[PDB]
Structure formats: structure tokens, C-alpha cells
Amino acid sequence: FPRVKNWEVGSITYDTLSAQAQQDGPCTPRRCLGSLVFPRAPEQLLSQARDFINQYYSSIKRSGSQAHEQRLQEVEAEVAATGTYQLRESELVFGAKQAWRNAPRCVGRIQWGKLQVFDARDCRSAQEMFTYICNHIKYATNRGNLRSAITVFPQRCPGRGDFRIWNSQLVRYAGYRQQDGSVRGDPANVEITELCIQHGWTPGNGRFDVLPLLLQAPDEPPELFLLPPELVLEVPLEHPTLEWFAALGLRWYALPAVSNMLLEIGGLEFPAAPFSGWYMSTEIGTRNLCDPHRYNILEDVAVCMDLDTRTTSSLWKDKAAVEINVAVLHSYQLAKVTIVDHHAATASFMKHLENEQKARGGCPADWAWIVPPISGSLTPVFHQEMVNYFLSPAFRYQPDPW
Amino acid sequence: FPRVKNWEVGSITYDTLSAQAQQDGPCTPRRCLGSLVFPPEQLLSQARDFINQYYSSIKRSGSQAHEQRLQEVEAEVAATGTYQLRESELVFGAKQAWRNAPRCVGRIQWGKLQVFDARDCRSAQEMFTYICNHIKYATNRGNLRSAITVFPQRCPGRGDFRIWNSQLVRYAGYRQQDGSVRGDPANVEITELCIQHGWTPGNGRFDVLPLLLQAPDEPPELFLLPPELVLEVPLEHPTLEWFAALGLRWYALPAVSNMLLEIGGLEFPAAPFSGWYMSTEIGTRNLCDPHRYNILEDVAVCMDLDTRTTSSLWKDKAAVEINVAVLHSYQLAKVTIVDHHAATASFMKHLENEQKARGGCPADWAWIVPPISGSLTPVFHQEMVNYFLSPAFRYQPDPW
Numbered sequence: 001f002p003r004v005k006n007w008e009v010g011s012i013t014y015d016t017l018s019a020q021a022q023q024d025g026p027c028t029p030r031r032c033l034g035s036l037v038f039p040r041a042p043e044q045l046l047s048q049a050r051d052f053i054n055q056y057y058s059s060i061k062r063s064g065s066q067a068h069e070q071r072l073q074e075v076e077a078e079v080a081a082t083g084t085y086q087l088r089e090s091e092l093v094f095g096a097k098q099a100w101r102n103a104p105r106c107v108g109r110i111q112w113g114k115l116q117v118f119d120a121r122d123c124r125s126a127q128e129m130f131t132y133i134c135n136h137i138k139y140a141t142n143r144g145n146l147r148s149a150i151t152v153f154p155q156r157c158p159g160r161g162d163f164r165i166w167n168s169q170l171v172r173y174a175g176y177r178q179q180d181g182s183v184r185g186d187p188a189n190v191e192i193t194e195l196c197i198q199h200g201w202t203p204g205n206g207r208f209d210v211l212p213l214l215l216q217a218p219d220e221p222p223e224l225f226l227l228p229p230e231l232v233l234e235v236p237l238e239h240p241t242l243e244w245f246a247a248l249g250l251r252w253y254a255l256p257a258v259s260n261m262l263l264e265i266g267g268l269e270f271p272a273a274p275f276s277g278w279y280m281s282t283e284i285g286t287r288n289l290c291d292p293h294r295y296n297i298l299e300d301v302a303v304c305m306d307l308d309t310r311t312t313s314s315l316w317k318d319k320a321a322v323e324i325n326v327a328v329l330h331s332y333q334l335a336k337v338t339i340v341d342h343h344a345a346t347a348s349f350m351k352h353l354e355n356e357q358k359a360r361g362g363c364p365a366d367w368a369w370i371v372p373p374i375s376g377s378l379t380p381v382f383h384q385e386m387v388n389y390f391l392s393p394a395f396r397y398q399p400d401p402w
Numbered sequence: 403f404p405r406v407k408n409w410e411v412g413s414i415t416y417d418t419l420s421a422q423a424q425q426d427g428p429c430t431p432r433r434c435l436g437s438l439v440f441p442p443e444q445l446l447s448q449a450r451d452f453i454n455q456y457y458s459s460i461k462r463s464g465s466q467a468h469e470q471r472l473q474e475v476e477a478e479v480a481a482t483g484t485y486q487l488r489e490s491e492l493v494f495g496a497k498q499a500w501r502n503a504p505r506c507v508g509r510i511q512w513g514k515l516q517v518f519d520a521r522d523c524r525s526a527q528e529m530f531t532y533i534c535n536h537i538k539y540a541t542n543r544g545n546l547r548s549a550i551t552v553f554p555q556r557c558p559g560r561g562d563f564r565i566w567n568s569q570l571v572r573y574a575g576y577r578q579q580d581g582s583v584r585g586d587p588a589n590v591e592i593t594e595l596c597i598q599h600g601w602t603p604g605n606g607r608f609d610v611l612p613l614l615l616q617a618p619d620e621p622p623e624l625f626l627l628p629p630e631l632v633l634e635v636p637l638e639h640p641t642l643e644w645f646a647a648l649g650l651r652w653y654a655l656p657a658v659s660n661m662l663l664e665i666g667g668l669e670f671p672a673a674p675f676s677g678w679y680m681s682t683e684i685g686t687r688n689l690c691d692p693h694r695y696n697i698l699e700d701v702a703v704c705m706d707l708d709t710r711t712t713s714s715l716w717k718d719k720a721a722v723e724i725n726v727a728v729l730h731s732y733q734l735a736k737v738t739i740v741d742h743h744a745a746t747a748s749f750m751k752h753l754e755n756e757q758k759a760r761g762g763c764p765a766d767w768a769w770i771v772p773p774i775s776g777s778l779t780p781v782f783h784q785e786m787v788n789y790f791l792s793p794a795f796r797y798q799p800d801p802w
């Protein structure tokens with residue numbers, strides 16, 4: 001059992017939960033590959049289902065009971081008859097929460113129990129899918145008082161294709177390859193933008209054009225759906241004391257809603273199950289606006305700030321990035337849209353680790369993703385050793401459907 | 403062969419050098435422990451391999467001088483059980499241990515290293531003069547030069563040469579009538595050992611500690627460091643005139659003196675090495691870590707920042723100004739220092755060099771990425787592979 005030290009306080013704990021990791025990651029005793037972004041049959045379906053049913057009945061303080069063994073035999077009977085099985089509603093709710101709880105790269109997991117689960121497993125078409133998605137966005141956005149939510153579409157099943165959302169998030173800004181060779185808008189989204197156009201979207205030419213949705217029903221080409229503008233809540237960016245900042249014309253959207261990941265519960269796979277929370281400000285201020293391969297505004301802000309950009313040792317990059325994050329926090333607070341700064345987020349994650357140590361004997365965590373991209377060692381998670389491993393239920397990456 | 407991507411550029415390389423990893427790391431397919439700080443005649447195996455390394459590096463594999471050297475180490479171990487490195491090998495192995503250090507961001511410099519051969523040392527008094535030669539050479543009136551001094555290799559039956567201080571320059575840490583510490587809390591322990599062995603404590607928050615030096619099979623001996631030999635930098639800020647009055651200082655020379663150098667199977671428990679500081683080490687970690695000098699709120703009060711809400715980013719603002727003061731102060735004192743933007747950009751160039759030269763480079767992402775402004779640096783966006791190569795610097799137990 002790995003020993004884990006907090007270097008700020010002196011705390012020492014052991015992660016006994018890692019011993020239960022029943023899927024393998026990319027590291028070996030030869031070489032650690034922890035820094036890599038993408039590090040990745042009825043009997044085996046049965047053993048996954050069995051373990052998850054055990055988890056569920058443990059959670060309802062009913063381990064080993066009549067109802068517990070009843071469900072086991074029921075699931076085996078159904079796999080033997082149909083090749084698969086169906087989750088009960090309460091199991092789907094529990095499994096979606098555990099998948100969030102188990103996500104090693106999520107710093108916001110203190111919230112894991114407060115998750116609205118929308119059961120869309122009856123969804124019939126891409127058009128019904130769109131209506132489900134709009135209701136998710138409306139509920140989650142809640143006029144700026146954001147609420148965590150997931151909508152679960154029908155599971156993968158033999159004999160029919162998958163439901164898929166092609167977009168990586170429900171809200172994304174277009175990225176248009178340009179004049180010279182630049183990108184106008186978000187360079188991360190050049191591919192999905194070109195797919196939308198190919199599928200009949202009439203592009204705009206702004207820097208913050210919200211993308212339409214490409215939604216795939218089983219054994220169907222994807223279908224294009226425009227989001228009503230009044231459903232997509234956005235925040236214009238201003239700075240509390242730098243008045244020229246508003247003239248940058250920058251915006252970001254309220255709702256972070258990941259839509260391209262696969263939800264796995266008890267061996268069943270839901271390739272369409274978009275989930276949303278609220279932003280940590282560094283995601284917007286540091287990564288989305290300052291990454292060199294994203295909006296890349298850092299030098300322009302630093303020039304406007306009259307910083308000396310010809311020498312690195314003036315720390316112009318650091319100073320401009322800090323004020324961009326200030327602008328994000330101030331703008332969302334002004335707009336009354338939920339946001340959490342990286343100091344509050346990491347302190348609440350420390351409490352989650354402590355809650356999880358008592359409840360489960362540990363917590364899977366990916367240090368490089370938990371530590372924020374600015375001011376790392378000023379937050380307490382920097383000084384916390386962590387153990388990264390894969391538990392199920394889980395959210396997993398999956399290939400792009402095109 | 404692991405695929406390694408740079409997400410800023412989209413470029414891809416493969417790490418073939420990882421296929422040589424000797425000492426196994428702490429990770430398994432089941433769980434990654436990458437964030438954890440501290441995770442007779444088989445001597446011929448590693449000596450053989452190290453000698454082969456040497457002669458390939460000078461393009462002398464499969465030639466007469468190469469075969470000849472293989473036999474002398476054969477005979478030396480057959481006769482005596484251990485072996486002595488040639489001077490050039492001791493030099494080449496020191497530079498390789500540095501080159502192979504996964505957590506070092508300054509390895510672009512690995513080819514420029516001054517090796518002082520103290521292998522004929524024989525007393526704690528001899529050590530002190532060696533250490534003193536190093537410190538004065540490495541400091542060089544503020545034009546810092548990378549240096550390592552290699553004390554004798556450990557042998558069976560006889561004790562070890564050891565430096566009890568973690569570095570050659572450390573500040574004292576004193577407990578109080580209330581537990582809390584005046585000075586550096588990372589050194590409270592070695593501070594209490596120094597006072598135990600007869601050192602008269604100071605009162606200040608930046609008292610340079612004395613050295614506890616350990617000749618084999620003797621108890622340690624205290625040594626006063628020459629004040630004019632410890633170059634220090636008082637801290638001031640270019641525009642915040644009150645920053646000077648906070649009385650902050652730091653020393654010029656980062657000289658790690660508790661690590662064990664391993665070359666060709668041989669083990670040097672006393673082999674202090676030194677370079678120059680990256681400014682975040684001082685400004686962010688040493689001065690702002692909650693368990694170190696923990697000055698962040700004090701600077702924020704002086705800046706009249708809103709410490710009442712985390713969302714003011716008052717910690718971030720104070721931290722950047724402390725780093726600015728470090729860089730400004732060292733530059734004005736003409737003491738070599740490098741900021742984290744320059745350091746990481748040079749490390750990316752090192753990575754490209756090592757890719758063509760050796761097919762990869764062991765790097766510890768969590769330690770290469772600076773502790774402020776991580777994603778503003780290129781190494782944040784660079785995937786890295788961590789593994790152990792030999793020669794190497796290794797951690798070792800405290801000598802008690």
C-alpha cells in the first residue's frame with residue numbers, strides 16, 4: 001500500500017484503495033508515463049457487472065441481502081439471454097455519481113454527490129436527443145446559478161450503432177482557418193468547425209461564434225442543430241481596474257459541458273452522456289485565453305499593460321496572466337454566473353481527499369491535472385503527494401466518431 | 403517505445419533511450435506514484451557498462467584502449483573487490499549523473515562542469531578546505547560556475563564521508579517558547595544538531611549555519627564558514643521601496659550536499675554539487691511555501707492587497723512581486739540567476755538536443771514545470787518520460 005505524504009503539514013496516509021484498481025494505466029517500473037494526456041465476451045461483462053452491483057448494494061447498506069443476490073442472478077440471467085443487461089434507475093444515478101467521484105483529473109469532486117442525473121435512455125432519434133440536450137443546458141445554467149448535471153443517452157448495444165455527440169463540449173466557439181494561415185476564433189475547434197460547415201452550417205466570421213451541435217443517432221449520419229442564442233449564457237470580459245480590457249471584446253460561456261467522453265458503469269458503455277459543472281477561473285483565464293495554441297492573448301494584454309515585453313526577467317507573462325484571471329473572476333461575479341478560483345477549488349479538493357481517505361481508504365488523483373496552471377505551489381494540492389489509478393464506474397476518452 | 407507529444411506545436415517523438423532504464427521506478431500498471439518525492443561481484447556488471455559508455459562517448463568503442471581498460475577493472479575487482487576510476491572517467495561520470503537527473507531543469511549546461519577530485523581526502527579538516535575551495539571557486543564573486551567535489555568512494559569495513567547539512571549554505575531555524583520558528587523551518591533539525599555539537603546560536607532570521615563534516619568512523623565535527631566566503635544577496639524591489647525594510651536575504655550558491663553520486667557501481671556518499679539558482683526556487687518555494695519562510699501574507703499586507711477574499715488573487719500578485727524582487731536583487735548584485743521562463747525555454751532546447759543525440763531524455767514533469775506560471779512555460783505542454791539511468795545522483799538516508 002503506497003504511502004502518501006502532505007509536505008505542507010507533515011500528514012502521512014496510505015492509499016489502500018489503489019489495490020482495488022481493476023484496470024491498468026500506462027506506467028511500468030521501467031518508466032513513468034503519468035504526464036501523457038491520452039494514456040490509452042460475456043464473462044468479463046459479468047465480472048464488471050458483479051462488481052458494480054456489489055458497489056451499489058454496499059452504498060445502500062444492503063450488502064449480501066436477499067435483494068442483492070436477486071440482482072446478481074437477474075443480471076447473469078439477462079446477460080445469458082440477451083448478451084447484456086439493463087440498469088435500474090437508482091443504479092444509474094449511483095453509477096453516474098461514482099464515475100464523477102472516480103475521475104482522477106477533476107479538482108471539483110467535493111461536489112460529487114450533488115449531481116442531477118437525467119435519464120435519456122429512452123431517446124429515440126437525433127431530434128429527441130437535441131431536445132434532451134437543450135433541457136440539460138437550461139437546467140444546468142439556471143440563469144447563472146449553475147447546477148451540476150449529466151444526461152445519459154442509450155447504452156451501446158449489439159446490432160445498432162451508437163448515439164454520439166460529435167462536439168467535444170455542448171458550448172464551443174468556432175475556429176476558422178484564415179487569410180494568411182492564422183485561425184480566427186478558437187484554434188482548438190478547427191476540426192469540428194470544418195465538420196459543421198461540411199454538414200451544412202453557414203459559418204460566421206467572429207472570434208466567439210457558438211458552434212452548432214452535430215448529433216449522431218445509431219446508424220445515421222450526424223445531424224446539425226443550432227442552439228438558441230438565449231439558451232447559451234455568455235459573460236463579456238472586463239477588468240475591475242483596467243478599463244481598456246473591455247475593448248478587447250473578449251467573452252466566455254457560462255457552462256462547461258463535456259460531451260465527447262464515454263460513461264462506463266458495470267461493464268455497460270454509454271458513448272453519449274454529456275456532463276456539466278461550473279468553471280474554475282484558470283481554465284478560462286490561463287488555459288483558454290493564454291495558451292499559445294488557443295486565443296493566445298498574453299502578449300497583447302502585456303503590451304496594453306505597458307509591461308516591458310523584451311526581457312523575460314520582468315515577469316511580464318506572469319503579471320499579464322494574473323490580471324487576465326482577475327478579469328475572469330470579476331466578470332463572472334459581476335454577471336452573477338457561478339465560478340470558483342483556483343485557491344478555493346484546491347482547498348475544497350483537500351477536504352475531498354480527507355473525506356475520501358476516511359470513506360474509502362484513498363482517492364485517485366492525477367497531480368499534474370489537479371495542480372492549477374498558474375500559482376501551483378501557492379495552492380495546497382501542490383504539496384500533496386497523490387496516487388493515480390483507474391476505478392470503475394468511470395468517464396473514459398473515446399475516439400472521434402469521424 | 404513511448405510516444406511523446408508536444409501539445410503547443412503538435413510535434414511527436416519516441417523515447418528509445420527509456421529502453422535502457424536500470425533501477426526500477428515506483429510506478430506499476432496499476433497505479434502511478436510519479437508525484438511522490440522519495441518513492442559482492444555484481445559490481446563488474448555496472449562497471450563494464452559504464453566503461454562501455456565512456457568509450458562510445460569518445461568514439462573509441464571496439465578499439466585497443468577500450469579493451470585494455472576492461473581488463474584492469476576486471477583485475478582490480480578480482481584483486482581488491484572494488485576499483486578506482488580514471489580521472490577522465492570520474493569527470494565523464496559526474497557530467498552523466500547530471501545529464502541523467504530527471505528533476506533538473508538546468509541540464510542544457512550539463513557539458514560545463516568543474517570536477518574537483520578529493521578522492522585522496524582523509525580528515526574532516528581536509529573536507530572543510532575542499533568544500534571551501536569549491537565554494538570560493540563556484541561563487542567566483544557572483545559569476546557562478548557549476549562545480550562538484552568528489553570525496554572518497556565508500557568501501558566495506560570503513561565508514562563514510564558525509565556532509566550532515568543538506569546544502570553547504572543553509573539558514574538556521576530556531577524553535578520558541580511557543581513552538582513556531584524564527585529562521586528557516588526546513589533546517590530546524592540540522593540547526594538543533596549544530597547547537598548540540600557546540601555551536602553558539604544566533605538570534606536572527608538568516609543566520610548561516612555551520613557545517614557538520616564527518617570523516618569515516620568519527621563523530622561529526624563543527625566548522626565555521628568564513629563569512630566573506632558565503633556570498634549573500636539582500637532583497638529589495640525595484641519600485642516597492644519598503645521591500646528592502648522587510649530584511650529579506652538569500653544566499654548565492656545552491657550546493658546540494660546530502661546526495662549520493664553513483665558511477666559505474668561505485669558510490670560516493672559525499673559529492674557536493676552546485677550551479678546557480680532559478681529564481682522561483684528562492685522567490686516561490688523558499689520564501690512563500692507555508693512550511694518555509696511563509697512571507698506571502700506579509701508582502702500582501704505591505705502591498706495593501708485584499709487578503710479577505712481568495713478571488714482577489716492577492717497570493718498570486720504578492721508571489722510575482724517577490725519573484726521580481728529576487729531577480730532584480732541578484733542582477734543588481736551581479737550574482738548569476740535565471741528566471742523560470744529562460745530556464746524552461748533552455749530545457750526545451752536541451753530536449754531537442756538529447757532527442758537527436760541519445761534518442762530521448764528522462765524528465766520528471768512535476769519537477770521540471772515551475773511552481774508559478776506553469777502553463778505559461780513551454781515545458782507544461784511537453785509530455786515527458788521519467789526513468790532512471792546510470793550514472794546518477796541518488797537520495798540516501800540521513801547519517802543517523
Ligand code: HEM
Nearest residue numbers: 100103105106107108111148149275276277278279280395
Ligand atoms: C461542479 C464544479 C466542477 C468543477 C469546478 C470542475 C473542475 C474541473 C477541472 C478544472 C478539470 C480539468 C479540466 C482541464 O484542465 O481541461 C476537470 C476535469 C474533469 N471533470 Fe470536473 N469539475 C466540475 C464538475 C464535474 C462534473 C459534474 C463531472 C461529471 C459528472 C466532472 C468530471 C470531470 C472529468 C471526467 C474530467 C476530466 C476531463 C478530461 O480528462 O478532459 N466534473 N474538472
Ligand code: HEM
Nearest residue numbers: 500503505506507508511548549675676677678679680795
Ligand atoms: C547550472 C545551473 C542549474 C540550474 C538552474 C538548476 C536548476 C535546478 C532546479 C530548479 C532543480 C529543482 C530542485 C527543487 O526544486 O527542489 C534542480 C534539481 C536538481 N539538479 Fe539542477 N540546476 C543546475 C545545475 C545542476 C548541477 C551542476 C547539478 C549536478 C552536477 C545538478 C543536479 C541536480 C539534481 C540531482 C537535482 C535533484 C535535486 C533533488 O532531487 O532534491 N543541477 N536543478
Ligand SMILES: Cc1cc(N)nc(C#CCN2CCN(C)CC2)c1
Nearest residue numbers: 168256257258275276277278279280
Ligand atoms: C464538467 C467540467 C467542469 C469544469 N470546470 N471543467 C471541465 C472541463 C474540461 C476539459 N475539457 C475536456 C474536453 N476538451 C475537448 C476540452 C476541455 C468539465
Ligand SMILES: Cc1cc(N)nc(C#CCN2CCN(C)CC2)c1
Nearest residue numbers: 568569656658675676677678679680
Ligand atoms: C545544483 C542545483 C541548482 C539549483 N538551482 N537548485 C538545486 C536544488 C535543489 C533542491 N534542494 C535540495 C536540498 N534541500 C535542502 C532543498 C531543495 C540544485
Ligand SMILES: C[C@H](O)[C@H](O)[C@H]1CNc2nc(N)[nH]c(=O)c2N1
Nearest residue numbers: 035036037368369782783784785
Ligand atoms: C503535457 C501535459 O501533460 C499537459 O499539457 C497537461 C498537464 N496538466 C494539465 N492539467 C489540466 N487540468 N488540464 C490540462 O489540459 C493539462 N494538460
Ligand SMILES: C[C@H](O)[C@H](O)[C@H]1CNc2nc(N)[nH]c(=O)c2N1
Nearest residue numbers: 382383384385437438439768769
Ligand atoms: C507533492 C509533490 O510531489 C511535491 O511537493 C513536489 C512536486 N514538485 C516539485 N518540484 C520541484 N522543483 N521541487 C519540489 O520540491 C517539488 N515538490
Ligand SMILES: [Cl-]
Nearest residue numbers: 256283284288
Ligand atoms: Cl473549457
Ligand SMILES: [Cl-]
Nearest residue numbers: 656683684688
Ligand atoms: Cl534552495
Ligand SMILES: [Gd]
Nearest residue numbers: 240241242243
Ligand atoms: Gd484604471
Ligand SMILES: [Gd]
Nearest residue numbers: 703704705706
Ligand atoms: Gd501605506
Ligand SMILES: [Zn+2]
Nearest residue numbers: 027032429434
Ligand atoms: Zn507513473
